[PDB]
Design a protein around this ligand. Structure first.
Ligand code: BCL
Ligand code: BCL
Ligand code: BCL
Ligand code: BCL
Ligand code: BCL
Ligand code: BCL
Ligand code: G2O
Ligand code: G2O
Ligand SMILES: CCCCCCCCCCCCCCCCCC(=O)OC[C@H](CO[C@@H]1O[C@H](CO)[C@H](O)[C@H](O)[C@H]1O)OC(=O)CCCCCCCCCCCCCCCCC
Ligand code: SF4
Ligand code: SF4
Ligand code: SF4
Ligand SMILES: [Ca+2]
Lengths: 94, 358, 95, 625, 153, 52
């Protein structure tokens, strides 16, 4: 959409994964928090369908290694279920 | 023309505190919609922490008015506590005096608030919910000493009416909400159920017979009712670590209205998520109720909202815009703020939101 | 204290405005080159063992790439201290 | 330099500051009045001519205060009238400054009666309710001026548009319409609603930019009006006068002081009389007045746009930019009209100056006969169309290039102004990447992507001023008769002295663009005063390079090294006398300081082109065969 | 002087068709500078209504409707799509389905509905003395059977 | 700070028979009018419009 709606830095609404707790299911606790940080969402296949098209991007915050199905190259190729590969940001202070 | 002069002030506190001072002045040259004029009134509300272990607080209220050459006084004084997060307990007493007649009373009450749903999606997709439907249930046991002839007359007439007619339970709502109040009940969004009488007794007391009545009623809302949708906000038992006050007074006449308000109490500012805080969402019942008297004369508007923040706090996303920043203060006047003031003084419920951070 | 700040590596451009506000007794912000500084090879970083959570780095609203985040004490992640309300738009023509 | 920023003041302090400034203006006008005195009514041979009074002398002579004569009664009466008017100005200015005190400190209380006053009612709440009564207030100023002329200066109102009595008649006609327009706006305020919320930055910027075009209008109106036969008694009566200025070539003195000096003149170090009709004084004053309003008018325009950007950026940071109904915002809140609008203006600017620059070099080539060419091969035939030849006297090729250089110069500066208007927060390239603008004054972002210098809107303002020099300077050449049509003219090289006759110019211009500098400075070098201005102007200008080049880090190097020398030199030559540690301007201050030295230095010298004579003949310059 | 200005700019157009046809084109623009009475701002919305003749023999038509809104930083979407027919002149039948999504939550549904409209009177004098009746009292009865798949917690 | 509206449409039922050979625009619906009247009384306003 227009540059003046939301944040001007990003081309679409950005999300981050913040929680990775294991509750009898491994990775039920995917907590999609938006850039503005007022909600705590989940995979929620509606979120997945709006991800796959053009509108959602998610990142992993180097601060669920296999339970989120890392595949095999460049130390990062995180995929959620089968379709889209959530890119990740790095924050290495060392 | 009918200019409307009003003056507002909010003063906040820093840290995690939520206390605030509120000040207000107002003037209009319009005739109030009162079929008896003139009319004057003063209100004192005080509250102090009875003890924090129980959560019990003590609250007092005094009303004096002169309504067309007639002095009216109402005193109430009570102790309230949250027994659960959806039940509340109260023990209090008071009196009411009109002209020469006067009588005391002592009540013993409980209130239960219930929401119609608890869906957590409504809690993770909407950051600032506004409308929330529910219902309140009141259980009251009140004792009034019968010492006057008129008190005994009222008591006997009420016993006869309750015994004889089969439609007392729903016709009592006609006598209950006298005059225009009843009409507001429909529009303001409320629904009062039929009362249910659990027994009227009379027992000997210190000076004589005392009439004891206990009764239950309920009222539901579509979300506009604050006492239901915001059950948690209106009784901040946590931050009452020192006495708080509310102290107002209006003085009406055949040619305009005078207003004067002081106050200091917690709950003025609330957390808004992401480190930002906000002024509490404006209550809707006062707006829509005052909108039933604010459409009678078109008027000119001038006002000045002056908000004072603590050290290091900044206002960001103030809609409409403010006009000045005297390094700690923010002032709103004219323009879109004036339009919003004229909008809300007629029953409009548009949102004027202020977010501040540090 | 709480609410750490965590410059993002991949988004930083090295403008250095974040580094200015940090008090001189606290040199929590530094530089990393690893290459030629014309195609983006001098991205900065934050030292967590010296930072004292001033918020001068976040509350100043200076980062142009959204590289400062200020993660909240519990789990929440910010990117800028306030975001506009993301409406959506069209075109009009008064006939 | 942000002590008086708009977001820190309330509404009354503006009124107080305006009243104080009006009082200061009255003081300085009185100062000018007594600077224009010749004889001192008691008799005390007064002052000599200076450029400040010579600019306003025609207006006084029109009003019957000053005069063009040298007698007994005339100068005595003129001095008395000037003293009276100066005293009146001093009194009113003192009163106005006291009223400024009264409005600055929130103290509207009567001194005689213990009364108070509310700024709200005494009225208006917003600025649109204030537009109305102001028109009523101005109707009183027009009414008073007609009264002042009629009662004091004579000049009964008569509709004769050849003498000044028409001015008195017009001030009464205007007071009718401004009053009538005042009531209607008091009952029906107009509506560009966004100017009331942040009303002391938004509304201010619109007014400042609007005043800029008004000043340019009066700049052009004065140039045409002052050359009419009606204005003859007040402007080219200057020619047949003799002027004594400060800094004139004085009566020189030898080393024998004996000392055979000069002409027969009793004062030693006397100021020589300078004829004002060989010296083109009638046009010199006209040029001075006109150019002042043109350059000030342009500068107000740039400032008005720049402050609109400061507001425009602010409403995009909190969030209201998405939130305007005013059509003045929705017509550019799309990012596809902006590229089209900026595209269509940067292409027209391309098509126009390339056309004139092709003509100017081709004419310049044809004179010098470079590449075996004649002057007959030049554009000596490109006159304006016959429907446009009324606005010019003696239409020719020199007018054709001027009418297009102004367009080429204006649109060249408009590019910066548009980029202030639209790309204050985001640009297509900055949104092409992930990036922000957040401060309207940040100097750069670093060497990333090859360099990010001068993208903020304050920098865009600097380039508009720098690009505006070419347009502004083109006016100085044109109004001084400089033949901007070719870049060499009157040069005795090949054919420059031929333009005359192959084009039937019927006038004679001073020189070409380059040869403008060699001529004209014949008189500048003759005056010691003008000579010092020449040296100072050039000294100030080139210092801009010290702060405009990419060297701020280099200057931060030496300041550290310097600090240690004045540190190691107070060590073993003199004893401990040193703690000073050299400051270097930041990049944002460097550009602010650089633009003033560049802009200030160049225009202190433009004054020399105007204030040195006219020197445009009327001899067709017969062929150099 | 006088009170607030608040101009309201609006632009309307009707375009008709000739003969016995009843079709028409409608166009509308509007603008006000007044704060909406919404306790959550800002608020945006688009609506699409389309209808096509499923088949004329049965009288069945197919009608779709899509709603998107952004209400104070919250995306809401409602899709409905159905088939409607007049079984009598006072009974109507409908079979349709749709979904509603708020933020991340979303769910579909399929409904099966009938509506009956009844007037309180049918006096023909009201039909021969009044040429353009306006007020007409009555009552509607809705019978709905809706199925929603339960898949979310 | 104000409200924006934009509407297109094309459908039958715009004009109805009125008897005696004349036709008419359909009687304006009343529910939208009375419902919008509950939000249209909050600010006095100036009016300008075309109907074409
Ligand atoms: C007004 C909307 C609802 C209502 C909502 C509530 C709410 C909400 C509560 C009660 C509670 C009570 N209600 Mg009830 N109640 C209503 C109508 C009634 C009626 C009646 C004849 O109509 C009666 C007899 C009662 C009776 C009672 C008692 C059972 C009980 C305690 C009263 C109290 O402490 O007195 C004291 C009287 C006052 C202080 C008068 C001042 C009231 C106004 C509204 C206070 C404004 C607060 C002001 C904005 C800020 C004050 C801050 C100062 C720092 C203190 N309610 C209406 C229908 N009722 C309370 C309870 O739970 O008890 C267990 C409670 O929390
Ligand atoms: C919660 C309301 C307050 C109350 C507030 C007022 C006010 C205010 C006024 C009176 C006034 C009077 N009161 Mg009282 N009054 C109360 C309790 C009582 C009781 C009782 C047995 O409890 C009695 C006999 C009376 C008697 C009297 C009337 C005889 C007298 C003038 C008529 C009037 O309008 O009455 C009003 C009657 C009542 C408000 C309720 C009376 C209760 C009945 C008799 C017993 C309960 C019956 C039923 C189960 C409760 C129904 C709920 C109420 C309708 C809300 N009051 C309760 C404590 N009373 C008037 C006065 O003081 O000077 C003229 C007046 O203006
Ligand atoms: C043609 C007259 C110009 C004008 C010429 C000046 C000049 C010249 C000055 C000001 C100055 C100021 N003007 Mg002004 N000003 C005008 C119209 C405005 C408007 C408006 C239309 O809303 C506003 C808000 C202001 C506001 C201001 C304040 C920034 C300041 C006065 C305080 C002071 O110290 O003295 N001006 C018109 C457009 N104004 C003074 C100032 O502070 O400058 C920094 C100053 O020197
Ligand atoms: C050209 C005239 C100047 C001006 C010059 C003065 C001077 C000088 C004085 C006042 C003083 C006053 N002016 Mg005034 N005043 C001006 C414009 C205004 C405006 C406005 C534009 O809204 C207002 C509200 C006022 C209001 C006031 C009161 C605060 C005060 C005494 C009341 C009275 O004289 O009348 N002035 C204009 C701009 N005004 C007087 C005062 O307060 O004395 C204590 C004072 O000395
Ligand atoms: C602030 C919002 C009101 C407004 C009401 C006023 C009032 C009231 C006044 C001005 C004043 C001025 N306005 Mg304004 N002004 C607005 C819209 C405009 C617009 C436009 C939409 O294009 C323009 C070009 C102007 C331009 C101007 C100048 C013509 C004029 C004096 C210049 C100065 O120094 O002061 N205004 C809107 C309508 N404007 C002053 C003036 O001279 O009016 C004749 C004045 O008193
Ligand atoms: C609004 C006043 C009455 C109402 C009046 C009607 C009417 C009248 C009808 C129904 C019908 C239906 N109603 Mg009902 N109905 C109401 C409240 C409800 C509620 C509820 C929870 O409140 C529900 C679940 C229903 C359910 C239903 C279904 C049983 C059925 C088909 C809906 C449909 O096709 O969807 C599709 C949904 C829409 C298209 C949304 C758009 C709705 C608006 C009003 C259409 C405006 C038309 C526009 C002005 C012009 C459109 C022209 C374009 C060219 C198409 N109604 C309210 C109380 N209801 C229909 C039926 O008979 O089914 C047998 C029918 O004709
Ligand atoms: C963008 C639009 C601008 C212009 C077009 C413009 C033209 C111009 N400028 Mg400029 N200028 C700014 C912009 C423009 N300024 C800005 C933004 C600034 C910063 C504020 C600025 C600054 C300064 C300073 C400091 C000085 C000048 C000069 C100066 C003048 C000399 C150039 C000249 O002779 O061209 C040569 C002109 C010819 C016709 C060439 C003749 C040769 C042969 C026969 C043949 C050459 C072959 C061929 C013809 C070459 C051209 C090819 C072309 C046709 C495809 C000249 C008129 C200099 C002087 O005038 O010094 C006396 C000078 O020193 N400015
Ligand atoms: C006349 C003009 C200039 C100077 C006078 C000068 C002085 C100076 N410059 Mg410079 N400069 C340029 C003009 C002048 N730069 C230009 C046009 C460029 C762009 C190319 C430029 C660029 C760089 C870079 C990149 C660096 C420097 C420096 C550096 C320092 C070196 C210390 C030194 O040599 O001691 C010797 C310094 C002196 C002997 C200065 C004494 C003078 C006496 C008082 C003459 C009076 C000056 C003037 C007439 C009075 C001012 C009145 C006015 C305000 C109305 C030293 C103060 C360096 C430092 O800052 O530190 C080392 C550095 O890195 N520059
Ligand atoms: C933007 C697009 C605007 C297009 C307008 C074209 C500009 C026309 C300029 C030529 C007009 C002209 O020369 O007037 C024609 C008149 C007189 O016209 C001729 O002028 C000659 C001057 O040498 C002689 O005086 C002749 O007697 C006379 O015939 O010239 C003036 O006196 C013009 C006054 C100065 C105009 C300044 C314009 C301000 C622009 C500055 C902005 C730069 C940034
Ligand atoms: S929060 Fe304070 S200590 Fe931490 S990096 Fe920012 S400025 Fe430095
Ligand atoms: S301000 Fe942002 S882009 Fe610049 S160095 Fe700091 S983190 Fe990086
Ligand atoms: S040389 Fe100066 S302007 Fe250029 S990138 Fe470096 S700091 Fe920025
Ligand atoms: Ca000259």
């Amino acid at each position: 959409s227009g540059p003046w709606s939301g944040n001007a830095v990003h081309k679409a609404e950005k999300y981050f994964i913040t929680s990775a707790k294991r509750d009898r299911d491994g990775k039920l606790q995917i907590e999609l928090v938006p850039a503005s940080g007022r909600r705590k969402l989940s995979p929620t296949p509606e979120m997945i369908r709006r991800l796959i098209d053009g509108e959602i991007e998610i990142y992993i915050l180097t601060t669920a290694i296999d339970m989120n199905k890392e595949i095999i190259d460049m130390e990062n190729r995180y995929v959620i279920d089968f379709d889209k590969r959530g890119v990740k940001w790095t924050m290495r202070e060392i | 023309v009918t200019t409307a002069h009003s003056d507002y002030e909010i003063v906040l506190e820093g840290g995690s505190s939520s206390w605030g001072k509120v000040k207000a002045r107002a003037k209009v040259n319009a005739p109030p919609a009162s079929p008896l004029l003139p009319a004057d009134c003063d209100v004192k509300l005080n509250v102090k922490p009875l003890d924090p272990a129980k959560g019990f607080v003590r609250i007092s209220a005094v009303f004096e008015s002169i309504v067309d050459s007639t002095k009216n006084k109402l005193t109430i004084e009570a102790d309230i506590a949250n027994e659960t997060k959806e039940r509340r307990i109260s023990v209090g007493e008071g009196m009411v005096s009109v002209g020469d007649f006067s009588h005391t009373f002592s009540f013993e009450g409980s209130v239960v608030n219930l929401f119609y749903y608890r869906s957590d999606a409504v809690r993770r997709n909407v950051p600032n919910p506004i409308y929330m439907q529910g219902r309140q249930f009141h259980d009251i046991l009140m004792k009034v000493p019968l010492d006057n002839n008129d008190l005994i007359d009222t008591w006997e007439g009420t016993v006869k009416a309750i015994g004889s007619t089969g439609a007392f339970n729903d016709w009592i709502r006609d006598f209950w909400f006298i005059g225009p109040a009843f009409t507001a009940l429909n529009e303001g969004g409320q629904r009062i159920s039929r009362i249910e009488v659990n027994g009227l007794n009379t027992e000997s007391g210190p000076k004589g017979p005392v009439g004891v009545s206990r009764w239950r009623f309920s009222h539901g809302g579509s979300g506009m009712v604050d006492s239901i949708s915001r059950w948690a906000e209106l009784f901040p038992s946590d931050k009452l670590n020192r006495p708080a006050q509310v102290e107002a007074g209006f003085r009406s006449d055949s040619q305009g209205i005078e207003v004067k308000v002081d106050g200091e109490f917690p709950g003025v500012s609330v957390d808004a998520g992401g480190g930002l805080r906000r002024i509490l969402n404006h209550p809707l019942i006062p707006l829509v109720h005052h909108g039933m008297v604010g459409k009678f004369n078109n008027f000119n508007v001038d006002a000045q909202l002056k908000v004072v923040l603590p050290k290091g706090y900044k206002i960001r996303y103030a809609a409409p815009q403010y006009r000045s920043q005297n390094l700690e203060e923010y002032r709103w006047s004219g323009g879109a703020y004036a339009r919003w003031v004229e909008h809300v003084c007629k029953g409009g419920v548009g949102q004027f939101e202020i977010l501040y951070a540090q | 204290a709480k609410k750490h700040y965590f410059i993002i590596e991949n988004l930083c451009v090295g403008c250095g405005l974040c580094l200015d506000k940090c008090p001189p007794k606290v040199n929590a912000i530094g530089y990393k080159f690893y290459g030629d500084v014309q195609e983006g090879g001098f991205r900065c970083y934050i030292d967590q063992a010296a930072c004292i959570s001033c918020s001068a780095c976040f509350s100043g609203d200076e980062c142009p790439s959204g590289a400062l985040i200020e993660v909240l004490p519990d789990g929440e992640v910010l990117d800028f201290s306030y975001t506009p309300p993301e409406r959506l738009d069209f075109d009009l023509r008064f006939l | 330099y942000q002590i008086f920023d708009t977001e820190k003041l309330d509404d009354e302090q503006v009124v107080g500051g305006h009243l104080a400034l009006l009082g200061v203006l009255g003081f300085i006008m009185g100062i000018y009045y007594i600077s224009g005195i010749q004889v001192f009514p008691w008799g005390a041979p007064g002052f000599h001519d200076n450029w400040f009074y010579l600019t306003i002398k025609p207006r006084m002579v029109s009003l019957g205060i000053d005069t063009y004569s040298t007698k007994t009664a005339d100068l005595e009466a003129a001095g008395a009238r000037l003293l009276g008017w100066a005293a009146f100005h001093f009194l009113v200015g003192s009163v106005l400054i006291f009223g400024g005190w009264r409005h600055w400190t929130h103290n509207l209380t009567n001194p005689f009666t213990g009364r108070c006053g509310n700024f709200r009612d005494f009225s208006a709440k917003s600025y649109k309710e204030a537009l109305g009564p102001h028109a009523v207030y101005m109707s009183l100023l027009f009414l008073g001026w007609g009264i002042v002329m009629w009662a004091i200066l004579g000049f009964a109102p008569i509709p004769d548009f050849q003498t000044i009595n028409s001015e008195t008649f017009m001030s009464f006609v205007f007071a009718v319409i401004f009053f009538a327009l005042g009531i209607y706006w008091w009952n029906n305020p107009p509506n560009a609603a966004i100017h009331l919320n942040d009303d002391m930055k938004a509304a201010f910027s619109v007014h400042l930019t609007a005043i800029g075009y008004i000043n340019i209008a009066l700049g052009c109106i004065a140039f045409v009006a002052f050359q009419q036969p009606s204005f003859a008694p007040y402007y080219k009566e200057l020619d047949k006068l003799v002027f004594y200025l400060y800094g004139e070539p004085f009566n020189r003195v030898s080393f024998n002081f004996s000392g055979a000096k000069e002409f027969a003149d009793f004062p030693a170090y006397a100021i020589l009389p300078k004829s004002g009709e060989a010296f083109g004084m009638a046009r010199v004053v006209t040029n001075l007045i006109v150019f002042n309003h043109i350059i000030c008018g342009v500068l107000y325009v740039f400032a008005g746009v720049y402050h609109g950007g400061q507001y425009l950026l602010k409403i995009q940071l909190n969030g209201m930019y998405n939130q305007i109904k005013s059509i003045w915002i929705t017509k550019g809140r799309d990012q596809e009209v902006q590229v089209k609008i900026l595209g269509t203006v940067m292409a027209l600017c391309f098509a126009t100056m390339l056309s004139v620059y092709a003509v100017i070099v081709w004419n310049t080539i044809c004179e010098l006969n470079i590449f075996g060419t004649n002057i007959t091969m030049s554009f000596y035939w490109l006159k304006p169309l016959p429907i446009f030849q009324w606005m010019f006297a003696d239409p020719s090729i020199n007018d054709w290039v001027m009418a297009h250089v102004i367009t080429a110069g204006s649109l060249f500066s408009l590019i910066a102004l548009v980029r202030i208007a639209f790309f204050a927060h985001t640009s297509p390239l900055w949104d092409d990447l992930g990036l922000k603008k957040n401060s309207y004054s940040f100097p750069c972002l670093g060497p990333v992507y090859g360099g990010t210098c001068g993208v903020s809107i304050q920098d865009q303002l600097w380039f508009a001023m720098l690009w505006g020099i070419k347009g502004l300077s083109a006016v100085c050449w044109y109004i001084d008769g400089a033949w901007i049509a070719s870049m060499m003219y009157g040069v005795p090289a090949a054919d420059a002295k031929a333009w005359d006759s192959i084009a039937h110019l019927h006038h004679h211009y001073t020189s070409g663009i380059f040869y403008y500098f060699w001529t004209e400075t014949v008189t500048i070098f003759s005056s010691s005063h003008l000579s010092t201005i020449l040296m100072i102007g050039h000294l100030v200008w080139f210092i801009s390079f010290a702060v405009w080049f990419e060297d701020r880090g280099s200057r931060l190097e030496g300041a550290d090294i310097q600090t240690r020398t004045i540190r190691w030199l107070g060590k073993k030559f003199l004893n401990r006398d040193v703690n000073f540690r050299f400051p270097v301007l930041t990049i944002s201050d460097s550009k602010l300081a650089g633009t003033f030295l560049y802009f200030g230095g160049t225009f202190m010298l433009v004054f020399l082109f105007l204030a040195n004579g006219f020197y445009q003949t009327n001899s067709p310059l017969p062929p150099p065969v | 002087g006088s009170n607030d200005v608040t101009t309201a700019h609006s632009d309307y157009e009707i375009v008709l068709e000739g003969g016995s046809s009843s079709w028409g084109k409608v166009k509308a623009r509007a603008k006000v500078n007044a704060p909406p009475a919404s306790p959550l701002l800002p608020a945006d919305c688009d609506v699409k209504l389309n209808v096509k003749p499923l088949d004329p023999a049965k009288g069945f038509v197919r009608i779709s409707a899509v709603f998107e809104s952004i209400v104070d930083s919250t995306k809401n979407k409602l899709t409905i799509e159905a088939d409607i027919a007049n079984e009598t002149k006072e009974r109507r039948i409908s079979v349709g389905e749709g979904m509603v999504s708020v933020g991340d939550f979303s769910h579909t549904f399929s409904f099966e509905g009938s509506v009956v409209n009844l007037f309180y009177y049918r006096s023909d004098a009201v039909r021969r003395n009044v040429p353009n009746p306006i007020y007409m009292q009555g009552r509607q009865f809705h019978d709905i059977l809706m199925k929603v798949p339960l898949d979310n917690n």
